[PDB]
Amino acid sequence: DTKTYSSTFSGNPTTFNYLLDYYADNTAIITNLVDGLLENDNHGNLVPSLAEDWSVSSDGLTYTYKLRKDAKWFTADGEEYSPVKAQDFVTGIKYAVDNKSQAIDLIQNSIKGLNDYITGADSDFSKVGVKAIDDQTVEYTLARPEPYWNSKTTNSILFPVNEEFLNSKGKDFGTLSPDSILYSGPYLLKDFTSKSSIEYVKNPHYYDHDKVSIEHVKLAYFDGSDQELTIRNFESGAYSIAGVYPNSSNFAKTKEKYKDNIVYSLQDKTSWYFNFNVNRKAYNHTSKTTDEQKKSTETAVLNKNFRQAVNFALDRTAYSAQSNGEEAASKTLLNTLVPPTFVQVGDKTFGEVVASKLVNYGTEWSGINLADAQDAYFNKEKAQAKFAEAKKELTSQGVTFPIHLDVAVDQTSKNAVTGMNSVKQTLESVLGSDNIVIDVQQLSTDDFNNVAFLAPTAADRDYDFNFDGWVGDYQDPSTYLNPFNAEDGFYLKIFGLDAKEDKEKITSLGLDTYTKMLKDADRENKDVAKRYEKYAEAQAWMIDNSLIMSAMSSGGTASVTKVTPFTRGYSLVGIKGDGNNYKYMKLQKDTVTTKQFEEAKSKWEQESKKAIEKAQKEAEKHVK
Amino acid sequence: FPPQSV
Ligand SMILES: [Zn+2]
Ligand SMILES: [Zn+2]
Ligand SMILES: [Zn+2]
Ligand SMILES: [Zn+2]
Ligand SMILES: [Zn+2]
Ligand SMILES: [Zn+2]
Ligand SMILES: [Zn+2]
Ligand SMILES: [Zn+2]
Ligand SMILES: [Zn+2]
Ligand SMILES: [Zn+2]
Ligand SMILES: [Zn+2]
Ligand SMILES: [Zn+2]
């Protein structure tokens, strides 16, 4: 019926500890079970959640939230545990900070006194700027004004937690058991079974239950190997939605039956990219047979000309053409970590300012165009010219050619294997097989996670070259650039680098320069455009030095669905505005037509801009 | 934050 959403999930959640872990595989579940202060409407605005009202002081340093009194904690079986109280938000911050939360960078230098508490300069948590004024009133005091602070509250590190429940659970809080957490969101977790099934049930006593349409959400684990019978399960009526893959063995019959139902998503908040390992130590998944090969590859990835040569030879259209259509491949393309229209800088977009900083860095960037839905980088002649310069400097260091680059892939996901094999075919043909060889290491899902995506330390990452992403956490360009800073960036590990042990290689690469540019940008809090311009300079550094090679965004791909379009929560940042938030999602009996979808998108476009204007003006009513 | 399905 319209009350049951049935689909698939492909991630491997590892923990429901929403205060210590902020990997999306986990928070995509948590967002339906735990509410924060605010959430997102279907237009992208921030709207009340647990907080029914809020205020900010004139100096922008004090944010006060009023908790609605019918906000309650429930156990997994649905029984009420306790009303949510403002002290639960103080407990959340202290627990997340005392246990070195993965997401600690979002609050460490923003909440007043928190950095002094973290470093041990002052161990009195009463001096930290989070307080419970009474049971319904929580107050955050900041180190500096942050217009994006309210957007930060849609991340789970800023979610509340009951202190009595946390202390009695102790070590057993936030495991993979539904009984390891308390529930304050629209749904209860009926069942989780790893690599099998997820089931939600609507919470009848949730304060906003009258807005929750879908009563049951059933997700079955999907490897990504049989891209087919998801469409057959959609035909059966077993599934509410099914992706359609043009490179499947039956797309011909699938297209002619669903010709009027195939719809394409929008580009959303995930920024995808390729990156090098510049400090590889683990060598358990490699086609290299000798030290000379390993020494050669290690020196090559540290050469700027080599990285630019690979960057200019990587055809992003071909990589996207393997999963999506050969025509539809260009829809997903993205050339920056910060979306080019994420912010405006005077009369310029962010991407336009980045390109203006980029052209001043070298003639290899003249004419650069970082717009969406097109490949800014691919250029065979500049790739070959860069590699010729790289080849002459690497031979002086005793580097043998061809260079072997390892890239690890999930063997079971056919999209990833064929995509990485297209990068192999492109890079080997543009640069020459006598100059570079791409060795695609097909690993099991567990194995790939053990040595790449979920590798415990930076020295455990077993590759020379990888494909990863990042989701915006708050409304500021720093959210896409801070993760790669060499002081405390959470994603510094993907380069194989550790902030303490690898400081001379960090300086050798110029990552100290990049970190200082971000620190220089972060000090700008009165002139917001100047702040954006200085983050644009840092984005230009990352593009030019080619440790990161931006590729595409999520979304922009094809599917057939029974989900009524543009009803779910929507956001550019946070965990409360993506396709995993079922609260506002609505289902229909008939399959969505391309006519219905494109008309809804047009009106959603109009109504969102009108709604965003009104919410920006209404927000001034809260400055009291 | 780190992405899904990667
Ligand atoms: Zn009841
Ligand atoms: Zn009701
Ligand atoms: Zn039911
Ligand atoms: Zn050896
Ligand atoms: Zn340069
Ligand atoms: Zn030269
Ligand atoms: Zn040598
Ligand atoms: Zn920092
Ligand atoms: Zn200015
Ligand atoms: Zn300027
Ligand atoms: Zn509306
Ligand atoms: Zn208001």
Residue numbers in the entry:
A (entry chain A): 29 to 652
B (entry chain E): 1 to 6
What does the report in the manuscript say about this coordinate set?
The system comprises five exposed Oligopeptide Binding Proteins (OBPs) and four proteins building the ABC transporter channel. Crucially, SBPs determine the specificity of their respective transport systems, thereby governing the range of molecules capable of entering the cell.
One such peptide, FPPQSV (peptide 1), derived from Prevotella species, has been shown to induce significant changes in gene expression and enhanced colonization when bound by AliD. Hence, peptides bind to OBPs, however, peptide-binding occurs with a low affinity when both, the fluorescently labelled AliD and the peptides as ligand are in solution and binding experiments are conducted at 25° C. The crystal structure of the AliD:peptide 1 complex was obtained by co-crystallization at 2.18 Å resolution. The asymmetric unit contained two monomers (chains A and B) with virtually identical structures (rmsd of 0.14 Å for 564 Cα atoms superposition). The ligand-bound and unbound forms of AliD retained the three-dimensional structures of the individual domains unaltered, as both conformations were related by a rigid-body rotation of ~20° of Lobe 1 (Domain III) relative to Lobe 2 (Domains I and III). Specifically, the side chain of the initial substrate residue (F) finds accommodation within a hydrophobic pocket cavity, designated as P1. The amine N-terminal tip of the oligopeptide substrate establishes electrostatic interactions with residue D501 and forms H-bonds with the main-chain atoms of residue V499, both from Domain III. These polar interactions are complemented by several hydrophobic interactions facilitated by aromatic residues such as Y50, Y51, W498, F481, F518 and Y519 (located in pockets P1-P3), resulting in the tight binding of the initial five residues of peptide 1 to the AliD protein. In contrast, the ultimate residue of peptide 1 demonstrate fewer interactions with the OBP.
